[PDB]
């Protein structure tokens with residue numbers, strides 16, 4: 001009850017910033033997560049022993065893939081922590097509980113392969129979940145872990161509050177399917193610009209949480225350039241392995257996934273910044289002005305990729 005997590009001074013200060021990198025010491029990531037829950041939610045939100053058992057079972061159900069790993073989980077939760085801390089009064093008690101957990105769980109049991117690859121492979125999960133294949137899986141793994149003995153971090157909630165938090169988590173995890181991001185953001189753009197955006201409308205809150213989930217999920221592009229650049233290596237290490245596996249199925253992969261087309265990476269990053277990232281953080285900044293540092297950091301990294309194409313690096 002009286003037991004705070006405390007971080008060294010440099011982390012205590014930098015963890016509050018959007019561009020914080022959680023560092024290479026894996027053993028400190030559980031502690032960093034608990035710290036963020038305690039400041040974001042309260043020391044009373046979860047029973048410490050249940051929360052610790054929950055975190056460690058989540059960690060175990062992430063795989064040793066180059067990018068969609070336990071470090072991604074905690075990184076995406078930190079971006080959500082920074083959004084929630086900069087927007088103190090906009091979110092409910094259940095939202096604060098649900099969203100950090102949603103972010104920690106959002107890529108549970110990821111194999112390093114896209115929905116497209118599972119569908120072309122004819123993976124059993126593509127028969128069980130026809131759209132948002134991996135995301136329905138990640139939600140299913142989240143419910144499985146919550147149901148392990150001593151892992152029910154929500155046990156003090158009422159039956160209807162429990163249903164509400166699991167519903168926040170489900171929609172938040174489904175929203176990380178980038179296929180769903182484009183339509184979600186277009187609707188949020190129209191709603192904001194015609195002035196119809198209403199944060200008391202649940203269907204509107206759902207849309208805004210979805211965009212937050214995309215923003216946190218993509219937050220590699222909002223880090224300082226040396227972090228962004230080195231993270232891109234891990235992202236492409238998965239895509240190129242998927243590309244190799246497409247070639248094994250007799251299917252030319254898209255260029256993004258073809259290791260023979262490394263030279264097209266700088267132009268592909270520009271497309272991604274211009275079509276996905278910048279528009280994502282722009283609409284987020286319009287709805288939640290204190291998230292502007294994410295857009296600024298994203299624009300700085302766009303300018304760094306432009307310099308790579310100009311052979312300035």
Ligand SMILES: Cn1c(CCN2CCOc3ccccc3C2=O)nc2ccccc21
Pocket residue numbers: 217218219220221232235255256257264265266267268269271272
């Ligand atoms: C479109 N696109 C990309 C985008 C890469 N990408 C896309 C999705 O994964 C991410 C998730 C979070 C943050 C960044 C990324 C990222 O770097 N690289 C490419 C190379 C050739 C052709 C098209 C390409």
Ligand SMILES: [Mg+2]
Pocket residue numbers: 106107134176177
């Ligand atoms: Mg995912």
Ligand SMILES: [Zn+2]
Pocket residue numbers: 072076106107176217
């Ligand atoms: Zn993710």
